[PDB]
Symmetry: C3
């Protein structure tokens, strides 16, 4: 029928758009994962050095 | 009409798919929230210890 | 045709719903960006002070 066909054009087309919204909304999640994951690696290295020196201190006494 | 019906099959079906893309794109946001929120709790505890010891140091003089 | 019209009601309507799922799934990403970005600025300031004092220590010897 013209229904069946319209109806299954919606089916196909919607299914491809769930898929699209997901792919893209994940992609922006991963933009800002990559953006705070960076500010962390930089805190971890600044803190690494802090543990280094304070191992050096404990050891002088 | 056959329009009205097709048209409102699209209505129903699309509305359920906005809903789906959201639910899932939130769910992946929460996968990677849970994944960096962890690396933080581990920096906070490593830093907690650093504050502990440096309270101990200040106090020795 | 009634197809063409139904078909292009789906077209319009779906396109507006990709757009919606995105806008909203980005908006929740930005809710929880803003929420861990905060816990970081608070670790950076707690750590700033730690670098301050340990510059003071190195300098006393």
């Amino acid at each position: 029928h013209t229904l069946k066909t319209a109806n299954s054009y919606t089916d196909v087309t919607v299914s491809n758009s769930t898929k699209k919204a997901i792919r893209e909304s994940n992609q922006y999640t991963d933009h800002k994962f990559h953006q705070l994951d960076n500010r962390l690696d930089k805190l971890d290295t600044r803190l690494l050095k802090l543990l280094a020196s304070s191992a050096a201190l404990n050891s002088l006494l």
